[PDB]
C-alpha cells in the first residue's frame, strides 16, 4: 500500500517537529529532520528469503506488518544501545562495525536474533499461527523472548501490563550487581501496551501521547489496525510521523564479511504522517533506558506528566505492587458515556 500512498512535504509551519525525543524547526532544521528519519532502521515486507521452518512462507507480504513494526522499534533500541541516539546514517560514509551487527540481527535468515523467521516461530508459542494477526502486545512479548539469546546487546525487556510500571520490578530485571559507591544495569527496553479508546483514541490521551515522543528515552509507538501497522517515530501539530512497512523488497543476500548493502533499510521518501485522530486505539509505547540514571530521569519525566490540563496519564508509575494474585492479561479503559 505504501507504493500508491500520497506523500506531501507539507511543512512549513511554526509547530515543532518532534522525532524520538528531539525537537526540530521545519524552517531551519529541515535537513536534520530528514536525516534523523532516514537514519532509523526501516523494515518492510521482504520476498525470497529462506522458507520459514523449511516449508512455510518465503515472503511476509500481507501478514508480517506488525512484525516489521516490532522489528523497527526494537532496532531503534539496539541503535541507541550500540550506536547512540546521536548516530546518523549517511551515504558515502563508513558506518561503525556495530551498525552492521545491529542490522545483521534483523536480516531475513533464521540465524539472525530478530529475523522475521525467529519472530514468526516464537509467535507460535504465543498462540499465533504464522500468518495470524499480531497486536502490539504479542509482538512485544515475542521480542522479550528473542532478546534472551542476544548476549551481545544483553538487554532487559520489560512489558508493563495493567497500565502500571513497577520500579522495583525494573530494578529486579536490570540490576546485574549491587551498585557501587560492562555493566551494572542491563540496558532497558520498556514496552507499555495500551488501549486508548473504543474504536478511536480518547482525546484526553492526546497530550499525554505527544509527550511520550518528547522524552530523551522515547522509542516511539507501534500501532495498528489489522494489516496497516505503523511505527510512529514522532509528531508535528495534530499529526504523528511514522515509518511504514507496506512495500515488498527483495531479501538482501546474507553477510559474507562485515559489509551489508543497506540502502533498502533506510526510508528516503517523504516521511509519512497521519492525524492522531485516525490512530487505532491499540498501541504499545516504548522507552529505552541505557543506564539506571536514564531510568531515574524517565521516572521523573513521567511524574511531571501527572499534571497540567492533560495529561491525563495513560499509565502509572509505582515503587512496588502487592503481587499475590493479579494479571496480565490486563489492559484498561477508561470509557466515558456513551463509549
Curated annotation (Swiss-Prot):
Residues modified as Phosphoserine: 25, 282
Molecular functions per Gene Ontology: cysteine-type endopeptidase activity; cysteine-type peptidase activity; endopeptidase activity; protein-phosphatidylethanolamide deconjugating activity; scaffold protein binding
GO cellular component, as recorded: autophagosome membrane; cytoplasm; cytoplasmic vesicle; cytosol; endoplasmic reticulum; mitochondrion
Effect of residue 180 to S: Does not affect S-nitrosylation. Strongly decreased S-nitrosylation, leading to increased hydrolase activity and autophagic flux. Does not affect formation of disulfide bonds
Effect of residue 272 to S: Does not affect formation of disulfide bonds
Entry-annotated residues carrying S-nitrosocysteine: 180, 258, 267
Consequence of substituting residue 25 to A: Decreased phosphorylation by AKT2, leading to reduced proteolytic activation of ATG8 family proteins
Catalytic activity: [protein]-C-terminal L-amino acid-glycyl-phosphatidylethanolamide + H2O = [protein]-C-terminal L-amino acid-glycine + a 1,2-diacyl-sn-glycero-3-phosphoethanolamine; [protein]-C-terminal L-amino acid-glycyl-phosphatidylserine + H2O = [protein]-C-terminal L-amino acid-glycine + a 1,2-diacyl-sn-glycero-3-phospho-L-serine
Effect noted on mutating residue 69 to S: Does not affect formation of disulfide bonds
EC assignment: 3.4.22.-
Family from the record: Belongs to the peptidase C54 family.
Subunit comment: Interacts with PFKP; promoting phosphorylation of ATG4B at Ser-25. Interacts with GBP7.
Role description: Cysteine protease that plays a key role in autophagy by mediating both proteolytic activation and delipidation of ATG8 family proteins. Required for canonical autophagy (macroautophagy), non-canonical autophagy as well as for mitophagy. The protease activity is required for proteolytic activation of ATG8 family proteins: cleaves the C-terminal amino acid of ATG8 proteins MAP1LC3A, MAP1LC3B, MAP1LC3C, GABARAPL1, GABARAPL2 and GABARAP, to reveal a C-terminal glycine.
Comment block on domains: The LIR motif (LC3-interacting region) is required for the interaction with ATG8 family proteins MAP1LC3A, MAP1LC3B, MAP1LC3C and GABARAPL1. Required for proteolytic activation and delipidation of ATG8 proteins.
UniProt name for this protein: Cysteine protease ATG4B
Amino acid at each position: 500500500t505504501l507504493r500508491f500512498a500520497e506523500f506531501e512535504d507539507f511543512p512549513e509551519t511554526s509547530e515543532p517537529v518532534w522525532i524520538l525525543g528531539r525537537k526540530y524547526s521545519i524552517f531551519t532544521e529541515k535537513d536534520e529532520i530528514l536525516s534523523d528519519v532516514a537514519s532509523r532502521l526501516w523494515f518492510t515486507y521482504r520476498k525470497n528469503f529462506p522458507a520459514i521452518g523449511g516449508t512455510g512462507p518465503t515472503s511476509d507480504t500481507g501478514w508480517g506488518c506488525m512484525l516489521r513494526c516490532g522489528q523497527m522499534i526494537f532496532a531503534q533500541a539496539l541503535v541507541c544501545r550500540h550506536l547512540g541516539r546521536d548516530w546518523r546514517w549517511t551515504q558515502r560514509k563508513r558506518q561503525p562495525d556495530s551498525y552492521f551487527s545491529v542490522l545483521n540481527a534483523f536480516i531475513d535468515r533464521k540465524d539472525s536474533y530478530y529475523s522475521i523467521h525467529q519472530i514468526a516461530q516464537m509467535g507460535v508459542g504465543e498462540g499465533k499461527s504464522i500468518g495470524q494477526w499480531y497486536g502490539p502486545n504479542t509482538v512485544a512479548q515475542v521480542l522479550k523472548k528473542l532478546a534472551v539469546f542476544d548476549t551481545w546487546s544483553s538487554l532487559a525487556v520489560h512489558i508493563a501490563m495493567d497500565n502500571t510500571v513497577v520500579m522495583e520490578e525494573i530494578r529486579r530485571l536490570c540490576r546485574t550487581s549491587v551498585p557501587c559507591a560492562p555493566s551494572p544495569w542491563r540496558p532497558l527496553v520498556l514496552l507499555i501496551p495500551l488501549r486508548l479508546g473504543l474504536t478511536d483514541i480518547n482525546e484526553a490521551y492526546v497530550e499525554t501521547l505527544k509527550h511520550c515522543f518528547m522524552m530523551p528515552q522515547s522509542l516511539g509507538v507501534i500501532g495498528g489496525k489489522p494489516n496497516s501497522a505503523h511505527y510512529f517515530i514522532g509528531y508535528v501539530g495534530e499529526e504523528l510521523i511514522y515509518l511504514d512497512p507496506h512495500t515488498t523488497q527483495p531479501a538482501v543476500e546474507p553477510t559474507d564479511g562485515c559489509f551489508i548493502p543497506d540502502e533498502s533499510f533506510h526510508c528516503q521518501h517523504p516521511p509519512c504522517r497521519m492525524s492522531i485522530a485516525e490512530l487505532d486505539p491499540s498501541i504499545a509505547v516504548g522507552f529505552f533506558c541505557k543506564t539506571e540514571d536514564d531510568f531515574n530521569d524517565w521516572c521523573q519525566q513521567v511524574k511531571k506528566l501527572s499534571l497540567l490540563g492533560g495529561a491525563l496519564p495513560m499509565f502509572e508509575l509505582v515503587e512496588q505492587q502487592p503481587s499475590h494474585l493479579a494479571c496480565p492479561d490486563v489492559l484498561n479503559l477508561s470509557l466515558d458515556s456513551s463509549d
